[PDB]
Enzyme design. Structure first.
Site, PDB file in Angstrom:
ATOM      1  N   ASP A  33       0.675  -1.316   0.177  1.00 43.42           N
ATOM      2  CA  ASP A  33       0.035  -0.029   0.237  1.00 43.42           C
ATOM      3  C   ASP A  33       1.200   1.202   0.306  1.00 43.42           C
ATOM      4  O   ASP A  33       0.691   2.144  -0.577  1.00 43.42           O
ATOM      5  CB  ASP A  33      -0.437  -0.004   1.165  1.00 43.42           C
ATOM      6  CG  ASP A  33      -2.153  -1.023   0.773  1.00 43.42           C
ATOM      7  OD1 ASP A  33      -2.747  -1.451  -0.032  1.00 43.42           O
ATOM      8  OD2 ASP A  33      -2.537  -1.525   2.223  1.00 43.42           O
ATOM      9  N   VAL A  92      -7.009  29.005  10.758  1.00 43.18           N
ATOM     10  CA  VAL A  92      -8.148  29.503  11.888  1.00 43.18           C
ATOM     11  C   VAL A  92      -9.049  29.181  11.939  1.00 43.18           C
ATOM     12  O   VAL A  92      -9.192  27.496  11.189  1.00 43.18           O
ATOM     13  CB  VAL A  92      -8.111  30.544  10.968  1.00 43.18           C
ATOM     14  CG1 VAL A  92      -7.220  32.028  10.162  1.00 43.18           C
ATOM     15  CG2 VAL A  92      -9.208  30.934   9.400  1.00 43.18           C
ATOM     16  N   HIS A 144      -5.658  19.027   4.940  1.00 41.94           N
ATOM     17  CA  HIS A 144      -5.304  18.520   6.614  1.00 41.94           C
ATOM     18  C   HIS A 144      -4.952  17.890   6.695  1.00 41.94           C
ATOM     19  O   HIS A 144      -4.101  17.126   6.426  1.00 41.94           O
ATOM     20  CB  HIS A 144      -6.923  17.340   6.233  1.00 41.94           C
ATOM     21  CG  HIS A 144      -7.589  17.770   7.708  1.00 41.94           C
ATOM     22  ND1 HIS A 144      -8.396  16.670   8.254  1.00 41.94           N
ATOM     23  CD2 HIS A 144      -7.443  17.872   8.590  1.00 41.94           C
ATOM     24  CE1 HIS A 144      -8.592  16.533   9.037  1.00 41.94           C
ATOM     25  NE2 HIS A 144      -8.089  17.350  10.020  1.00 41.94           N
ATOM     26  N   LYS A 150     -13.496  32.229   6.849  1.00 38.65           N
ATOM     27  CA  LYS A 150     -12.536  31.702   6.390  1.00 38.65           C
ATOM     28  C   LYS A 150     -12.547  32.241   4.797  1.00 38.65           C
ATOM     29  O   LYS A 150     -11.918  32.118   4.103  1.00 38.65           O
ATOM     30  CB  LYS A 150     -12.614  30.265   6.083  1.00 38.65           C
ATOM     31  CG  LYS A 150     -12.481  28.952   7.083  1.00 38.65           C
ATOM     32  CD  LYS A 150     -12.709  27.582   7.171  1.00 38.65           C
ATOM     33  CE  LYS A 150     -11.746  26.686   7.924  1.00 38.65           C
ATOM     34  NZ  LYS A 150     -10.556  26.875   8.215  1.00 38.65           N
ATOM     35  N   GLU A 202     -12.496  27.179  12.476  1.00 42.71           N
ATOM     36  CA  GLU A 202     -13.046  26.275  11.325  1.00 42.71           C
ATOM     37  C   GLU A 202     -14.366  27.108  10.953  1.00 42.71           C
ATOM     38  O   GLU A 202     -15.596  26.779  12.568  1.00 42.71           O
ATOM     39  CB  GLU A 202     -13.411  25.169  11.793  1.00 42.71           C
ATOM     40  CG  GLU A 202     -13.883  24.096  11.372  1.00 42.71           C
ATOM     41  CD  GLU A 202     -14.098  22.163  10.957  1.00 42.71           C
ATOM     42  OE1 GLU A 202     -13.251  21.744  10.213  1.00 42.71           O
ATOM     43  OE2 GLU A 202     -14.030  21.875  12.457  1.00 42.71           O
ATOM     44  N   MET A 205      -1.767  24.265  14.910  1.00 39.21           N
ATOM     45  CA  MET A 205      -1.907  23.964  13.777  1.00 39.21           C
ATOM     46  C   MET A 205      -1.033  24.782  12.442  1.00 39.21           C
ATOM     47  O   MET A 205      -0.238  24.339  12.300  1.00 39.21           O
ATOM     48  CB  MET A 205      -3.356  23.490  13.039  1.00 39.21           C
ATOM     49  CG  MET A 205      -3.974  22.957  13.750  1.00 39.21           C
ATOM     50  SD  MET A 205      -3.597  20.761  13.511  1.00 39.21           S
ATOM     51  CE  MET A 205      -3.633  20.863  12.245  1.00 39.21           C
TER      52      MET A 205
HETATM   53  N1  LIG Z   1      -6.646  24.760  11.715  1.00 43.01           N
HETATM   54  C1  LIG Z   1      -6.920  25.154  13.110  1.00 43.01           C
HETATM   55  C2  LIG Z   1      -7.576  25.234  14.126  1.00 43.01           C
HETATM   56  C3  LIG Z   1      -7.574  26.680  14.491  1.00 43.01           C
HETATM   57  C4  LIG Z   1      -8.245  26.791  15.665  1.00 43.01           C
HETATM   58  C5  LIG Z   1      -8.729  26.033  15.785  1.00 43.01           C
HETATM   59  S1  LIG Z   1      -9.905  26.264  17.739  1.00 43.01           S
HETATM   60  O1  LIG Z   1     -11.275  26.491  17.923  1.00 43.01           O
HETATM   61  O2  LIG Z   1      -9.311  27.693  18.566  1.00 43.01           O
HETATM   62  O3  LIG Z   1      -9.204  25.550  18.805  1.00 43.01           O
HETATM   63  C6  LIG Z   1      -9.120  25.029  15.201  1.00 43.01           C
HETATM   64  C7  LIG Z   1      -8.853  24.083  14.801  1.00 43.01           C
END
Ligand SMILES: N#Cc1ccc(S(=O)(=O)O)cc1
Ligand SMILES: N#Cc1ccc(S(=O)(=O)O)cc1
Ligand SMILES: N#Cc1ccc(S(=O)(=O)O)cc1
Ligand SMILES: N#Cc1ccc(S(=O)(=O)O)cc1
Lengths: 729, 392, 391
Positions: A316, A422, A472, A429, A424, A346
């Site tokens: 795979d 940022v 992702h 966005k 979600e 992230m």
């Molecule tokens: N990519 C990404 C991301 C940024 C902030 C958050 S949070 O909801 O502010 O904890 C969740 C995911």
């Protein structure tokens, strides 16, 4: 008793060249004509059998041997196409094959003459086992060369003498921990320090001359022991002692319990078999020890876990890193400057792996203060790597110098690759990309790190919908090896290829997924955590739930994972799934885990980010299960078998993977298997969440038919969400 | 069939592990000294009547190897036809040798048998014999081996016995052992150890700390919180008992049995062998059982008795939590359990503890003029042996 | 009161010492393989009704330490209530396990019991466990320690057995052992040893040399010349047997028992326990005794004489011990070790007693005879004996 596997009435390919010199040194150069790498196949066993028969016949004119290779690597791997077809009735053939192989190395090693291994490139598996049969090992210090015995990572063990010889060289404990149990791969300099290799040279051209020089000096300085291994002399003492020595026998009963603790109870039989062969072999002589190693090897090859790990971590992964999900007619587009929107865990991790790979990264947030703390994520990672000695100050400063914190949207000048990380939110966005799409290069990839929200609806917030794509990542980005590439309806084939190239450039593995709410990873990880919360509502002891997760093979127990996923996010995900069904006119059938989720939100325990979840948190660390958890859900009023808790989790994800393949979310089972192991943590011994069906093994049978039978058992007792899809019937 | 009677039950004093008085004494010399004491008490005993010598020994290696029962027969000048067999059944060996002696008499194919055990743990430590498990990781892996010390800690966590509760029982065992020594209760069954010149080596159980206080026990540090994850045995225990989250390590060197040296001898025989030799029975073996907490019920179900029929309960104090669970599970009155102290105060010589605490009950039955005693051993886990004796 | 019956008597083949096929097998696995064979033959057996497992073992150290009987109960998945005890009575340990299990049945406090022995002498040689009467000079000096081999040569000297006489018996033991194997006598009781893949490891008794001649036997040099002059064991022996002048050393490796590996298991239970589990008794334990004068002790205890016994089974530790035993009770030649013995097949210490007991259970059935007598560690000393009835 023979060095050939057959001794009765076609013919393989010769892979070894015989050169004897004036002084009497024979040089064995391995060069399989049917491949660019020397592998452990039938052509090698026949060829090495002929060369060994010839060393014995011409022993009176031969003074020494040098084992060399003509490829870029020394000798790496085996014939996996043949090993994976080994059924239980083949145990006789497997046992005889490795006994012949090891008899070849046993004759070469007790030849009465010095044998030197000229390790030019990589010697892995059978390669290092061949070099271990020699009396002296010189390796060319070059870029990319690796030495090790990684058979355990495929559900096997070093069956060609690797276990017996490393134990005879380093002792039981140092051999198992450092070399065998984890299949660690070593660099030529690291191999000289642990005794795997004796000398290092600068280039490959000096190897054969350095070997012949060592042979000539060895026959002069120490002739009585020329060609005699340390364990073939009268005064041999195993380092660390034999099993019957008092020092080792005091800790020996604790080796299996320590192994039982690293695996957390998971049913992975290869490390157990390695520890057994290592210890049992240290109790007898070499040739008896070697035969015990064959029997443990044969039982692993004819088993199911090996087939699962060979299918996943060989075949795979071959197809993925060969471009299986990459579009065909696309060329290479180099990347100059990367733009990252968001200095959270992230975005900061995304900026680190991109900078570590050599890319110029611009890290933007709403304030310079937040952006500067995002780059601090890389400072703390480089601090640990300096203290531990994995990177220099020169390398570390250049890495950190490619990250540029900013708060200005105009600092995206000349950015040709955007990765937004940022909050979600659909309309955040849109605003964040609106302020960037006009400043960046006109050919810029506009990627989004989204976990559930569909990319097609996200792409409507930019003008070039052909270059908007899902990218992702997984927390923490520096350790998680998978990237989930998500294709929208308008995302072009070139954007997929350019992000595919970027995934391999940063050293990660890409899967390609079609657009759908939940994608693949977030949708399948939800079924896993929703099963555990369902058990908690049913009244199962929380300690049993966590043990069920660990003994199944998951890296993190489910209640611990839920706090990190945040229960607030889990709840409004269920609200989005409920809306997507009630908007289509249908009636929503909720998961029984939704009642548990709302109760923990009701009690103010929404996860780790809020300082209180199923676990307690103090001083920024997890500190035991919340005591009031057993009273909230009347824990103990339901005590199902542990194997039923384990199966409910494994089956929930396997069934959901199948429904992802039926709906076109995934395009191949290779993506499903690797994406389930490297993405969400599905146990490696299963070969993936799709291999879990075709390879299922339980007390009632094996295969797809047994999986269907077990899923119907689970459905009759625990709910119709375990009824197999029609595509399996 | 034929009733098996106890005619004598003697034992050496128990010598401690570090700077112990019995460290210089070969374990063969411990048995021989008891054999010579039986001659001093019955100088006209026809030793050709004795047809077997059964000694329990958990580590039959080194000083304790080569069938130590047979060495004792030969070294002490007993007839060559007196046999000699060693057996090993973990903590129960000393009592299994007695029950096997009683069963050899009940079968009718034997008449007079010496039984007991010996253990010089200071010269042959526990585990010296190797192990059909520790030298075999596959077996160790599958059976999920856990040392009994961790299991006792797990019993305290499951049953709810706190660190104060196990210390309360340890204080009780040291107090009752001191009162039994001061009261003269052990004056006629503890045979002082003497050298070849007749000089005193040891005359008391020197592991005792009769000045124990509740505060001194609270200052001791947990004994198995350093072997837990050091071998990973706490995790191995919780993989099996998966509903438990955290093992509470409450057992220290002060509420666990002591590592000591000693030996014990019991003389088992029929009624006909008693009359013929001029011997008066002291107790009668009513029933024996082997199971595993369920061996105690299996032996009561065999003699037709209940808990209230037994006047004295004698359970080995390997760990405080084991005894506390046994007490709560069968509702044993505190005044009936280990009335003369136990292994916590006096020590636990593995191969010999069984015959040591059986002889303790024969003497306490006569001192109290009570009928029945129940002696049980190695209860923890799957093994376990129990015996009921009745004063004659 | 109760009567002890034998329901099964199985044993592994006996692997030789040098280049032995069982050298890689742990002794724990030798027993577990025989346990799984009893399951294969009685899958309906409620293992909860097995109350003890008693194994003979003479060198319980290393691979054979830590109560190997308990390890067999655990490793084979038997119930944790099945017990497990090891014992040691030198050469008689295997038969002492059987007799003890019979007595535990007769006492009424045990229902069904597994008994037997195991000994991997090529992995754990005799003496590996130590011992006082060997490694404590005061006791050794006083008891006049002499190895059992020197004692066998002494027996040949006093009784007057020549080198030609012991070798003649060594040939019969090889001939009868070959005839028993070739005739299928051992087909149902010898359970071949297999590995974890089902592959065969051993299926016959390796130590046998079926083509033995008396010319080859005479070529062998005496086996205990170097031991008797290493520590002066001849002199120590003659100090007690002071009326004999010189020991005639007539024992070699061809007329003494072989050093081998193996195990054996015997299922002993009451009559009531047999009906419940659907078990058919194959033999009955008539009497057991401990002490030539242990054979008599079990004859008087059972009210029998030599004429009433159909078959005699004496372990062939040394040829002179069997010959002396034959002339002391006038044992006919056709009643003594009919299917060979340890000279041909080996003597795995702790397991031998349980092995040769099963050998007589099958020969009683095959011959349709009544009684057989089994004895080991014989010649005064510390001997054991047992009489079985075919049922
Ligand atoms: N990519 C990404 C991301 C940024 C902030 C958050 S949070 O909801 O502010 O904890 C969740 C995911
Ligand atoms: N090594 C090896 C090996 C030998 C034969 C087979 S097969 O079962 O015959 O296909 C599989 C593996
Ligand atoms: N069959 C097989 C086989 C394949 C790969 C390897 S290696 O771990 O990659 O060196 C070892 C053995
Ligand atoms: N009020 C306020 C404030 C927030 C951030 C910054 S910074 O420039 O991002 O360090 C400066 C002032």
């Amino acid at each position: 008793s023979s060095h050939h596997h057959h001794h009765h009435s076609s013919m393989p390919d010769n892979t070894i060249q015989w050169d004897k010199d004036a002084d009497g040194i024979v040089t064995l150069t391995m060069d399989d004509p049917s491949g660019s790498t020397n592998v452990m196949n039938e052509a090698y066993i026949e060829s090495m059998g002929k060369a060994v028969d010839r060393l014995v016949a011409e022993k009176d004119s031969i003074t020494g041997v040098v084992v060399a290779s003509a490829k870029k690597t020394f000798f790496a791997g085996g014939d996996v196409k043949t090993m994976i077809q080994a059924r239980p009735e083949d145990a006789g053939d497997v046992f005889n094959t490795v006994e012949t192989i090891k008899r070849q190395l046993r004759t070469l090693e007790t030849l009465g003459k010095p044998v030197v291994a000229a390790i030019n490139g990589a010697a892995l598996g059978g390669g290092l086992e061949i070099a271990l049969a020699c009396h002296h090992r010189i390796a060319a210090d070059v870029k990319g060369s690796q030495l090790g015995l990684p058979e355990v990572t495929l559900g096997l063990l070093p069956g060609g003498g690797g276990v017996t010889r490393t134990v005879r060289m380093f002792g039981i404990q140092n051999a198992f921990v450092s070399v065998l149990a984890q299949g660690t791969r070593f660099k030529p300099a690291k191999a000289k320090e642990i005794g795997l290799v004796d000398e290092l040279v600068a280039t490959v051209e000096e190897l054969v001359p350095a070997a012949k020089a060592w042979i000539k000096e060895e026959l002069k300085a120490n002739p009585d022991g020329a060609g005699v291994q340390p364990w073939d002399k009268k005064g041999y003492k195993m380092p660390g002692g034999t099993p019957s020595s008092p020092g080792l026998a005091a800790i020996l009963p604790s080796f299996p319990s320590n192994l039982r603790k690293q695996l957390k109870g998971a049913p992975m039989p290869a490390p157990r078999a390695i520890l057994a062969a290592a210890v049992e072999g240290a109790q007898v002589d070499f040739d008896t020890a070697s035969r015990i190693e064959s029997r443990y090897f044969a039982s692993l090859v004819t088993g199911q876990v090996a087939k699962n790990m060979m299918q996943a971590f060989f075949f795979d992964l071959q197809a993925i890193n060969a471009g299986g999900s990459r579009p065909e007619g696309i060329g290479k587009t180099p990347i100059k400057r990367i733009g990252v929107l968001g200095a959270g865990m992230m975005g900061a991790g995304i900026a680190y792996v991109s900078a570590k790979a050599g890319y110029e990264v611009v890290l933007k947030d709403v304030s310079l203060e937040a952006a500067a703390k995002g780059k601090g994520y890389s400072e703390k990672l480089e601090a640990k790597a300096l203290e531990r000695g994995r990177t220099t100050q020169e390398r570390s400063d250049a890495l950190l110098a490619r990250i540029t914190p900013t708060a200005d949207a105009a600092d995206f000048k000349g950015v040709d690759f955007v990765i937004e990380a940022v909050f979600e939110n659909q309309e955040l966005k849109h605003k964040v990309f609106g302020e960037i799409e006009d400043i960046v290069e006109p050919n810029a990839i506009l990627g989004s790190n989204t976990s559930t929200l569909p990319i097609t609806g996200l792409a409507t917030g930019v003008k070039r919908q052909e270059d908007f794509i899902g990218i992702h990542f997984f927390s923490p980005v520096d350790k998680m090896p998978l990237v989930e590439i998500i294709k929208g309806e308008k995302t072009s084939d070139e954007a997929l290829a350019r992000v595919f190239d970027y995934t391999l450039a940063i050293g990660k593995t890409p899967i390609v997924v079609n657009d759908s709410r939940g994608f693949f990873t977030s949708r399948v990880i939800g079924t896993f955590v929703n099963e555990a919360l369902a058990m908690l509502g049913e009244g199962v002891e929380p300690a049993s739930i966590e043990q069920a997760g660990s003994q199944a093979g998951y890296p993190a127990p489910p209640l611990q994972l839920s706090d990190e996923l945040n229960l607030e996010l889990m709840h409004k995900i269920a609200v989005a799934t409920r809306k997507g069904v009630e908007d289509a006119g249908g009636t929503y059938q909720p998961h029984p885990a939704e009642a548990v989720v709302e109760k923990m939100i009701e009690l103010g325990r929404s996860g780790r980010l809020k300082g209180a979840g199923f676990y307690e948190y103090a001083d920024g660390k997890r500190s035991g299960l919340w005591p009031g958890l057993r009273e909230t859900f009347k824990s103990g009023s339901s005590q199902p078998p542990l194997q039923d808790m384990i199966d409910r989790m494994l089956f929930a994800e396997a069934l959901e993977t199948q429904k992802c393949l039926d709906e076109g979310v995934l395009t191949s089972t290779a993506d499903a298997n690797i994406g389930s192991i490297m993405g969400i943590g599905f146990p490696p011994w299963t070969g993936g969440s799709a291999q879990f069906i075709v390879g299922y093994s339980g007390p009632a049978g094996t295969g797809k038919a047994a999986f269907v039978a077990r899923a119907r058992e689970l459905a009759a007792a625990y709910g119709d969400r375990f009824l197999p899809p029609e595509s399996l019937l | 069939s034929e009733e098996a009677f106890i005619y004598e039950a003697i034992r050496t004093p128990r010598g401690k592990q570090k700077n112990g008085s019995l460290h210089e004494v070969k374990p063969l010399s411990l048995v021989v000294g008891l054999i010579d004491e039986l001659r001093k008490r019955h100088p006209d005993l026809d030793e050709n009547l004795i047809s077997d010598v059964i000694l329990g020994c958990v580590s039959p290696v080194g000083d304790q190897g080569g069938d130590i029962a047979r060495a004792a027969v030969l070294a002490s000048g007993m007839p060559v036809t007196s046999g000699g067999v060693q057996l090993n059944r973990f903590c129960a060996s000393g009592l299994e040798a007695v029950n096997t002696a009683a069963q050899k008499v009940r079968s009718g194919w034997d008449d007079l048998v010496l039984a007991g055990g010996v253990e010089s743990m200071s010269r042959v430590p526990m585990g010296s014999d190797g192990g059909a498990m520790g030298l075999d990781p596959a077996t160790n892996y599958d059976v999920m081996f856990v040392p009994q010390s961790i299991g006792a800690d797990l019993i305290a966590t499951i049953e709810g016995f706190s660190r104060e509760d196990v210390d309360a029982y340890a204080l009780r065992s040291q107090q009752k052992a001191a009162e039994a020594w001061s009261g003269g209760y052990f004056a006629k069954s503890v045979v002082p150890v003497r050298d070849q010149n007749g000089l005193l080596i040891l005359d008391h159980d020197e592991h005792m700390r009769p000045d124990t206080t509740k505060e001194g026990l609270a200052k001791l540090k947990p004994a198995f919180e350093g072997l837990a994850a050091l071998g990973g045995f706490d995790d191995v225990a919780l993989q099996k008992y998966h509903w438990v989250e955290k093992i509470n390590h409450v057992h220290t060197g002060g509420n666990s049995s002591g590592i000591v040296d000693g030996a014990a001898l019991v003389m088992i025989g029929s009624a006909a062998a008693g009359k013929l030799q001029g011997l008066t029975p002291r107790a009668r073996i009513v029933a024996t059982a082997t199971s595993g907490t369920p061996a105690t019920r299996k032996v009561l179900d065999r003699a037709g008795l209940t808990v209230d029929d037994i006047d004295l309960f004698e359970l080995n104090e390997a760990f405080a939590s084991v005894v506390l669970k046994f007490q709560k599970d069968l509702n044993i009155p505190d005044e009936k359990l280990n009335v003369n102290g136990g292994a916590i105060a006096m020590g636990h010589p593995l191969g010999a503890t069984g015959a040591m605490i059986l002889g303790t009950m024969v003497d306490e039955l006569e001192r109290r003029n009570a009928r029945r005693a129940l002696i049980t051993l190695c209860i923890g886990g799957g093994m376990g042996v129990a015996t009921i004796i009745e004063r004659v």
